[PDB]
Write a protein that binds this ligand. Structure first.
Ligand SMILES: N[C@@H](CCC(=O)N[C@@H](CS)C(=O)NCC(=O)O)C(=O)O
Ligand SMILES: N[C@@H](CCC(=O)N[C@@H](CS)C(=O)NCC(=O)O)C(=O)O
Lengths: 204, 204
């Protein structure tokens, strides 16, 4: 009955969802897409995510309902299981606020830092600085919030799960966390979770 | 009024003023002047630690603050029962297309604006990257809009999030030509009285 099909790859956005699945204890199976062979752009996959990116899930127990966008998947799974997002109005909204901060801010900006720092054909220092500086500013917003609360929305939630896999690779992006003591505490706490350790290994 | 709206005349601010106008919620406008750096003032950072607009304070809910346009939209829809279905699949479709906007259209078209209009040096590579990526996202929107009248089926907060960005495509240097479904959707939304009102907030 219960089964999530997960279409993913070893990237921060993929790890968001595998971490969530491991935390929640939901049965799932992994379809690891090869970017090398453009499998994320194949017609059969566009039927599931028209954007042709990972992650996406198909919920086999819900008439093979497709969900794309890591943040939407996290919300779907949290509502499905009642875990990792409070049911009350304020608690729920706080989670969604920090989740949106990740989806609109941390992920896209740090991703562009990766692009210009590591992947772009030509070296453009102006673009590199823009994104590394913007990522660092966002990290400072997180650090400030984590001075008032143990996790972003209070208790650990899908907002922390969305954000951690990006912060985790800050060195790859060329962004330092020096001086960010609250963020560092949070990094240490999350990386110690067994579900997080298991989720980071998917796909293998 | 029940809602205090902190905003400025940008696509992200227009998402929320459009939403409030569609829903018939009374609100008070606080137009922040970036010229005087009002969005970096400590009193505003208490509401949105990221120091950006839009943000709201819901007077009807113990002065609860909500930041991030996408989170504000979900909050308002849940408060009013408007512009997002109650059922599992219907709700999720809205959230998926909302996340597509928040993580994709907004950030990518915003970077196109930066390199095309605002960056201290002309970097044709960067301009091309974000204009091409924006066009690619528009084509995905166009495809979906062949399957349904609006992004999630019925008109919803997912359309309200996406329209203020598509509306300014020319500023970003990106064409909608050849995208007949997207063009149908642009025309249908621009014809809505509440959209016309929301786009005028705040006044000069
Ligand atoms: N906002 C989306 C972004 C997903 C995304 O950027 N996925 C990347 C890998 S981390 C991808 O599939 N890239 C392959 C491609 O664009 O061809 C989400 O969070 O799910
Ligand atoms: N993802 C955020 C983006 C907010 C955002 O970037 N707002 C801009 C105006 S559209 C802003 O406040 N910029 C002023 C600044 O960056 O200082 C949201 O949708 O609320």
């Amino acid at each position: 009955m219960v089964m999530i099909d997960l279409y993913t790859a070893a990237t921060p956005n993929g790890h968001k969802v595998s971490i969530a699945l491991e935390e929640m204890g939901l049965p799932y199976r992994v379809h690891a897409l090869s970017f090398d062979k453009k499998e994320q752009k194949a017609p059969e996959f566009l039927r599931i995510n028209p954007n042709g990116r990972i992650p996406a899930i198909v919920d086999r127990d819900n008439d093979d309902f497709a969900v794309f966008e890591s943040g939407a998947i996290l919300i779907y799974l949290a509502e499905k299981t009642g875990q990792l997002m409070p049911a009350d109005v304020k608690g729920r909204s706080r989670v969604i606020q920090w989740l949106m901060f990740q989806m609109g801010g941390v992920g896209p900006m740090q991703g562009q830092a990766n692009v210009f720092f590591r992947y772009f054909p030509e070296k453009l220092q102006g673009a590199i600085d823009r994104y590394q500086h913007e990522t660092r500013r966002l990290y400072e917003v997180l650090d400030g919030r984590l001075g008032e609360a143990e996790y972003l929305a209070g208790d650990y939630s899908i907002a922390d799960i969305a954000t951690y896999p990006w912060v985790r690779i800050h060195d790859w992006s060329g962004v330092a966390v020096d001086g960010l003591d609250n963020l560092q505490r949070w990094i240490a706490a999350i990386e110690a979770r067994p579900a997080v350790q298991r989720g980071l290994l998917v796909p293998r």
